[PDB]
Amino acid sequence: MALPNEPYPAWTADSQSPVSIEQIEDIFIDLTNRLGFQRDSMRNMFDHFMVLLDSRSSRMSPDQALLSLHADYIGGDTANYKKWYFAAQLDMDDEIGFRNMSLGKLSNSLEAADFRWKAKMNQLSPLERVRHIALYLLCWGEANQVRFTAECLCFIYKCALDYLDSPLCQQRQEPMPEGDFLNRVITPIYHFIRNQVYEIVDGRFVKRERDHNKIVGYDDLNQLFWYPEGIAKIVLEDGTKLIELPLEERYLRLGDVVWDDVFFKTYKETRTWLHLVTNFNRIWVMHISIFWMYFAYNSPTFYTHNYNQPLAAYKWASCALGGTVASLIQIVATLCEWSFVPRKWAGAQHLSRRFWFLCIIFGINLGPIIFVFAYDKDYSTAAHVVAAVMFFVAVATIIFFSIMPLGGLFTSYRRYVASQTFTAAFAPLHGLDRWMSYLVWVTVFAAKYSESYYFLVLSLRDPIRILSTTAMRCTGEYWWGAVLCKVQPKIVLGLVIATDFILFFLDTYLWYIIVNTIFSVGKSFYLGISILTPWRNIFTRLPKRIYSKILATTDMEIKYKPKVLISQVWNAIIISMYREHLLAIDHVQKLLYHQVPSEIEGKRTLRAPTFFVSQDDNNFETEFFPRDSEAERRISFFAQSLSTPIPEPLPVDNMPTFTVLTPHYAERILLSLREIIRRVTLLEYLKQLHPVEWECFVKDTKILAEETAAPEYTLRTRIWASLRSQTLYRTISGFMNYSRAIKLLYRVENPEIVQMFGGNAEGLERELEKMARRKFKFLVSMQRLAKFKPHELENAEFLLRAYPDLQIAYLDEEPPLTEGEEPRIYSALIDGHCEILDNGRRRPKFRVQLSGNPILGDGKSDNQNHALIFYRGEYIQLIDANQDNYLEECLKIRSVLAEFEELNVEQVNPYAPGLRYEEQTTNHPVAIVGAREYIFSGKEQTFGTLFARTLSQIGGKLHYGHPDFINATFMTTRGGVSKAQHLNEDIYAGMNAMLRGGRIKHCEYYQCGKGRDGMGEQMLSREYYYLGTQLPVDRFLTFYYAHPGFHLNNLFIQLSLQMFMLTLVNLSSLAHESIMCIYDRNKPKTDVLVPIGCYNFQPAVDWVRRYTLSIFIVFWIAFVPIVVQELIERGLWKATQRFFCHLLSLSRIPFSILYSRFAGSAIYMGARSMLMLLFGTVAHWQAPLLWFWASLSSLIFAPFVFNPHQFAWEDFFLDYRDYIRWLSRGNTNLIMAEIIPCAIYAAGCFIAFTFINAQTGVKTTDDDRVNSVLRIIICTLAPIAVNLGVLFFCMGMGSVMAGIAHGVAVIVHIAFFIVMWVLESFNFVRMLIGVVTCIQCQRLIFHCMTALMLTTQPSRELTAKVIELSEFAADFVLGHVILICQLPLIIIPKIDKFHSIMLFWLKPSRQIRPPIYSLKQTRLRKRMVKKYCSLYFLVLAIFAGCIIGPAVASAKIHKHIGDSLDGVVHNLFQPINTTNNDTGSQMSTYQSH
């Protein structure tokens, strides 16, 4: 009688409740009779409302519970309905944008409408507030896809409310037919969404094939209701408009709207780089425009005439062109953005106004610069002062354009591109959070710009002066003379600057990591965590930290002895670990709190485990739990997390209700005996993996078996094996520790309740379970429970008997009501307490009909949305089906729900006339609280973990993921779990929540567990557009460098490696042919260069040292946050494992598949770069080039060094056998992406080739020009021509007739590698650049050919064949070189065992059973392993012979092949006996040609 039995005791048992359940029920019933809601959906939402009303009034008064629920749903500043109303109903979106900007920089009007709205809300009676929330929930509970479009539902709510309040409805006598709201209103909107993606093909539904710019999605549908212009587009069937009807007559005609003639695309996606320019224009302005000024200032030789350090007016006016560059990036950004947006919507007339202001600013920068340059008398103060002034106009332009957001440019004079309410409403940072965001980004760019000047630019001052002034003394080609080879130093310079332009971008990410690592270690030190202390200090203080931070002991109870309560909670944790078979009996006893007889007889005493004492008493080093154990992990994280700031909890009865929502489609529920016991079966594979867990399991099995002394025993092995594998049972069993934790806390903190029962221990467990049923709900969404196979159906029924309180929501098809129509779909809810019908299926508690099949998109989010109407409580924890939790973490739930900042706060009237928006303290609610996750059994994955504390403080966390909790009333009123309209990562998934004003938090003291499993389409999303062009700079820099700046960093690293190869092949080609001066160290600029006539290119060659260091640091800096994170928690040695797991990540898979899986990914590019790297080292050797050898050897030889059983003799040559069988058997967006980049690379190699044959420094005349351009044509087209020539034999004449053509292509391609080698007169260095050029030239030839035939018909299939013969030889020759490289190590005896020991010693040593072959097949194995062994040794004898052939052919004293040709073919073979050292004391005949 002292403990109420009613379902909602905090409301019903309180006498201060303004309205009873009877009145609240009559309101829900009246609304259903009036608007035709489903009766079963009304019962669901009536139950949902009462739980919200009972979880709220659990911690406040019932009057404040109803008032705060009305504010959060209808009329508060946190209500999405108030935001939509002030934007779409009152045209006040621009006023909201003005005050957002004014409030963001802090640490008839809008104000009159706000005061008028608060006074209308304040006069509502409690019954009117119930009717408002009930109407919204009833509309929300039958929306089922309009839940994804929040603002479409606000419009439907207002149409329904206006109709409801009218005499047209109050005077109506008959009720609306049941299901009328869904049939007439919701279903047509669903049919629009479905017909955008699906088509009817003779009766079924199959996806349409359309680009994403033809599909009107959820966002394009939602945004119509953001503006009064959009609502003015809603048109009825008869032709009229919806807004032409009185307010109360519009709901009744929402079924006559032709939604196809209304909805339209609001944001079209385009080419990826067009979005990067607009969305991240502030990133390009600073790097691109500061780079210009850095290099214009440090390159006086580009504007000095007849090179003279004076005449500074030219130096200042040349830097001042960085303001013209910044003003031009903004023009291009505005032009790109003008193509994403429809031309008459939401703004975009302000886009044309902005373009003209940016054209004025750009003219102001350009104009006076033209005056300075073109009106100078070759020290004119009329131009020396202009140049100085225009340098600061340039600087001020750069600062303005890289600070101020693009969308908020010139908006002070529809002024915004998108509505502010829903797109530009980010929560500002205040106080210490704000100053840390400033300090991070000031430090990142003060350190970046400081050392990018001294190391990237000042080091280049002499290379720029030298390479831009020297002219080569070459002879050149026959076709153009010496006009291309005398500008080679300038071509080398232009490539060097372009390579340093990309290093300018890699530099910023280098400093983002360095600064964030220091700030994430100084934050831990300041917060007191500061983990360098031994674990003895962490564990000794644990007993006191359990009393404070877990036990809610702020003295409601009368000061019980703390040791009693800690023991009751510490022991339950350990017993939980012991029943999980993680602790042995000798471990547990040393860890428990033990009752001991007192000094006084007939008494008991509590004493702490030595674990809490022996750590302090370090005389001994006993083991309480095993090394590297899971109990070692969980206890060490538990004690470590309780050393951090944790909010103090509420009593359990004051706790909010929450829900765990889990989507399930096809995952395994339980392991069945078939798949555990029948190359090693599952059950015996687990014993090998979890040995000590199993023996403790059987040891308990022995006790249980001998207790009864099998169906009981066969189950506990299915359960034991399921709890070690990724199953749904393991997740459900792990997250029912919330029910166990809530019961334990309720019992430990309420001794009076327990003592009240006093021996009625069975009746107490009813009381503890009644409370845990009230505060925790587990909801699993089983999408296909209606189509479960009987073994799966039996698995699900086992869940509902082990856990009666678990609820399962499922889709329930139903025959069509009339023949030749669509089946009816329902959402149904069952649980363990449901009556079990005759057919073995439980009768559903609720059964709500949908408009149609809800699964229209990418799966998970549609599943979560159908089951979302059955969630209860204030918070939802999203959970994935392959997770699990622990009791010691589930004990911290009351302090994780306190991160939403609604539990221990005062309640004020949200409609009080005194307050103004600016002084309200609840304007930005916490939307998401994220938590750490443990992966049991990547760069950015563990980048975020170390930075998560700093990124959450400065607003940089946008994670709508699976391990985290959400504010249910905030999120479900604003679109829900996701959008279901695209393989988006969850790293940036809740930014709709952040765009709409919610904050996203991160707690470091909670950690669940989860099992493991190009730019992307993320860059084309509108959320990047809204975030990029509207965030303030400090918060834009955190947004860019967290997710998208990481993906661009990877791209820039690759581009920087391909531009170094093009630069190196030209810088080594220039150093090979030049006599370079002795590089005197510590010498002035105009000092004497020792060999008179030399080239001073040693400074330019040393640039390779500096670039190599830069890209070496850039590689190894991505590991610093990885090592520091593990070094600071594990402490000494586990950093090494994560360092090597990260580094290594970067039967026997055959070469036929392993090579083909990485051929177009790393092998092809890395084999072309290795040829270019090979030329670089032989042409001019430098030590730093070794790192590019190691980094390219690994890139190619990684997949073939970790393949198990790759390196043994016998299996090696059998893999070659199937490799050969694989070879024979089997019978403007493209141009601007990889066609021009492919031509530039061929041109850059062509320049390097022709210069190395330019005879630099040979005393020649006009007829000593070589025709090295012809050598390219002869060695590029001729192998292609003969590839086509044989295909005309096949048509003139299917493996024998094809392998002859396949064999011919290999022969000719190798033959012309030999033809080039002799055209260069047997010069190995000149051949390498010759062959590289031809490979790149054929790639360009096919690349333009492929796009030409893939935008005649008989050749449209022929061209794809000649492209393939040359392609085939590329695979044949490249494949063997990988194989031939395996030769020196297979001949090492005992290499397979030697290699495979570390293949399993460093990793867990998984064992595959050694195969046993027939003694008849073995005789065939011996033959065939020695059959193709004699072929691999012969292809190696042909590949080798092609190398020692021309190499030995140097014994050709006779002058050179073809001494008597004349004309376009004279000197087709490079001359010899020519010494290109024309430097020295000789000063006559300066003219080498």
Ligand SMILES: CCCCCCCCCCC(CCCCCCCCCC)(CO[C@@H]1O[C@H](CO)[C@@H](O[C@H]2O[C@H](CO)[C@@H](O)[C@H](O)[C@H]2O)[C@H](O)[C@H]1O)CO[C@@H]1O[C@H](CO)[C@@H](O[C@H]2O[C@H](CO)[C@@H](O)[C@H](O)[C@H]2O)[C@H](O)[C@H]1O
């Ligand atoms: C060596 C390294 C280089 C140093 C960089 C030097 C550049 C200096 C930038 C100065 C700066 C960025 C600071 C962030 C540092 C990040 C550095 C990263 C470097 C980038 C590579 C600080 O901005 C000022 O800082 C003040 C202090 O916090 C604060 O003033 C407040 O507190 C005072 C005290 O209580 C108090 O007196 C005062 O009343 C308060 O108002 C305000 O934020 C602001 O006045 C400017 O930021 C911009 O300021 C704009 C108007 O404010 C702001 O509004 C603009 O955009 C909106 C949309 O259209 C819209 O509002 C408008 O269109 C437009 O007006 C922008 O949103 C914002 O982005």
Ligand SMILES: CCCCCCCCCCC(CCCCCCCCCC)(CO[C@@H]1O[C@H](CO)[C@@H](O[C@H]2O[C@H](CO)[C@@H](O)[C@H](O)[C@H]2O)[C@H](O)[C@H]1O)CO[C@@H]1O[C@H](CO)[C@@H](O[C@H]2O[C@H](CO)[C@@H](O)[C@H](O)[C@H]2O)[C@H](O)[C@H]1O
């Ligand atoms: C103000 C900003 C300035 C910043 C500096 C800008 C430098 C950026 C240059 C990058 C660039 C321009 C080259 C020059 C073009 C002409 C310009 C005129 C030149 C002067 C006259 C060439 O660089 C790219 O780099 C790739 C990596 O090396 C490489 O791809 C090669 O390596 C791979 C792994 O090794 C491997 O797949 C394979 O070996 C190759 O594919 C190619 O070389 C090339 O695609 C183009 O970048 C690319 O553009 C793509 C679509 O726009 C974009 O793809 C996205 O959209 C696609 C649509 O459907 C979609 O299909 C993609 O899924 C999607 O991801 C790429 O993300 C982006 O990379």
Ligand SMILES: CCCCCCCC/C=C\CCCCCCCC(=O)O[C@@H](COC(=O)CCCCCCCCCCCCCCC)COP(=O)([O-])OCC[N+](C)(C)C
């Ligand atoms: C000692 C002297 C050595 C020189 C030997 C030279 C003799 C060679 C003689 C003949 C071989 C020439 C055949 C290829 C000709 C056509 C080129 C071609 O098809 O490119 C293709 C790949 O193919 C390559 O990239 C070739 C790479 C070089 C490997 C060949 C030599 C390997 C030796 C060096 C090994 C490392 C050396 C380091 C030290 C060992 C490009 O295909 P794709 O464009 O990526 O297709 C993508 C699909 N898409 C278009 C739709 C996107």
Ligand SMILES: CC(C)[C@@H](C)/C=C/[C@@H](C)[C@H]1CC[C@H]2C3=CC=C4C[C@@H](O)CC[C@]4(C)[C@H]3CC[C@]12C
């Ligand atoms: C970053 C952009 C906006 C502009 C400011 C960059 C300017 C750089 C390239 C140039 C312009 C003014 C230069 C100037 C400032 C101070 C002097 C001292 C003088 O004895 C030698 C040159 C030296 C050391 C240079 C350093 C680099 C500067 C700062």
Ligand SMILES: CC(C)[C@@H](C)/C=C/[C@@H](C)[C@H]1CC[C@H]2C3=CC=C4C[C@@H](O)CC[C@]4(C)[C@H]3CC[C@]12C
């Ligand atoms: C990738 C970018 C940075 C490349 C294309 C730019 C290179 C420019 C900045 C550099 C490379 C070589 C330089 C070049 C070398 C010498 C000459 C001749 C002189 O009478 C005027 C300056 C002039 C014409 C300059 C102009 C600027 C040049 C062209």
Ligand SMILES: CC(C)[C@@H](C)/C=C/[C@@H](C)[C@H]1CC[C@H]2C3=CC=C4C[C@@H](O)CC[C@]4(C)[C@H]3CC[C@]12C
């Ligand atoms: C990134 C750096 C390396 C590049 C962009 C530097 C570019 C500037 C320094 C160079 C490139 C083109 C040059 C430009 C082209 C032609 C003229 C006219 C001549 O009578 C004097 C030099 C003068 C006036 C120079 C001025 C300086 C310029 C603008």
Ligand SMILES: CC(C)[C@@H](C)/C=C/[C@@H](C)[C@H]1CC[C@H]2C3=CC=C4C[C@@H](O)CC[C@]4(C)[C@H]3CC[C@]12C
């Ligand atoms: C938004 C950015 C683009 C705005 C604020 C511009 C910042 C520039 C002007 C400022 C920020 C940091 C400054 C930087 C830091 C330290 C020195 C070292 C000195 O030997 C050369 C100039 C140099 C390298 C200056 C150049 C000017 C810089 C680069």
Ligand SMILES: CC(C)[C@@H](C)/C=C/[C@@H](C)[C@H]1CC[C@H]2C3=CC=C4C[C@@H](O)CC[C@]4(C)[C@H]3CC[C@]12C
């Ligand atoms: C990379 C290639 C495509 C570039 C360098 C080719 C340029 C050639 C085709 C063009 C550019 C300017 C022309 C030109 C300038 C100087 C040369 C060398 C001289 O003795 C005869 C005239 C001659 C031959 C002519 C004809 C062809 C030239 C050299």
Ligand SMILES: CC(C)[C@@H](C)/C=C/[C@@H](C)[C@H]1CC[C@H]2C3=CC=C4C[C@@H](O)CC[C@]4(C)[C@H]3CC[C@]12C
């Ligand atoms: C990114 C790389 C691939 C591209 C940009 C390389 C560009 C450099 C090599 C090329 C592009 C424009 C060229 C440039 C334009 C015209 C003149 C002709 C002559 O008077 C000197 C060489 C000079 C000055 C050359 C030097 C080399 C340049 C600068």
Ligand SMILES: CC(C)[C@@H](C)/C=C/[C@@H](C)[C@H]1CC[C@H]2C3=CC=C4C[C@@H](O)CC[C@]4(C)[C@H]3CC[C@]12C
């Ligand atoms: C005026 C110059 C100095 C400033 C604006 C810099 C311009 C370059 C660095 C930037 C601005 C515009 C960019 C450009 C616009 C659109 C795409 C198409 C895509 O398929 C390849 C990359 C590409 C072609 C990129 C390449 C890099 C560009 C050309």
Ligand SMILES: CC(C)[C@@H](C)/C=C/[C@@H](C)[C@H]1CC[C@H]2C3=CC=C4C[C@@H](O)CC[C@]4(C)[C@H]3CC[C@]12C
């Ligand atoms: C001020 C800007 C415009 C100047 C300095 C820089 C231009 C660079 C960034 C742009 C222009 C030309 C581009 C270039 C042309 C061809 C090569 C090799 C190809 O296989 C991949 C793309 C790649 C690697 C890209 C890299 C980025 C480049 C080099």
Ligand SMILES: CC(C)[C@@H](C)/C=C/[C@@H](C)[C@H]1CC[C@H]2C3=CC=C4C[C@@H](O)CC[C@]4(C)[C@H]3CC[C@]12C
């Ligand atoms: C990576 C590739 C794309 C870069 C390096 C090549 C750029 C070529 C197209 C550019 C850079 C150097 C230029 C070259 C340098 C000097 C002049 C002399 C003039 O009388 C004719 C044009 C001519 C001969 C031009 C022709 C075009 C060239 C060769």
Ligand SMILES: CC(C)[C@@H](C)/C=C/[C@@H](C)[C@H]1CC[C@H]2C3=CC=C4C[C@@H](O)CC[C@]4(C)[C@H]3CC[C@]12C
């Ligand atoms: C792998 C096979 C196909 C190798 C052996 C092919 C070799 C032939 C195709 C190539 C290799 C080098 C070539 C050889 C080098 C230089 C000369 C001198 C010239 O005045 C006539 C052609 C001649 C004599 C050619 C003939 C064809 C040869 C011999």
Ligand SMILES: CC(C)[C@@H](C)/C=C/[C@@H](C)[C@H]1CC[C@H]2C3=CC=C4C[C@@H](O)CC[C@]4(C)[C@H]3CC[C@]12C
């Ligand atoms: C196994 C095969 C692929 C090996 C042996 C091929 C070797 C050929 C291609 C190599 C080795 C010896 C070379 C040979 C020896 C000397 C002469 C000089 C001149 O008179 C023409 C080229 C010529 C004839 C070259 C051509 C290329 C040859 C013939």
Ligand SMILES: *[C@@H]1O[C@H](CO)[C@@H](O[C@@H]2O[C@H](CO)[C@@H](O)[C@H](O)[C@H]2NC(C)=O)[C@H](O)[C@H]1NC(C)=O
């Ligand atoms: C190219 O020829 C010049 C001139 O014969 C050589 O220059 C000599 O280099 C040595 C090396 O220190 C100096 O001691 C001599 O004083 C230089 N001679 C003159 C006249 O300056 C140069 O070494 C040669 N380069 C080669 C052979 O690679």
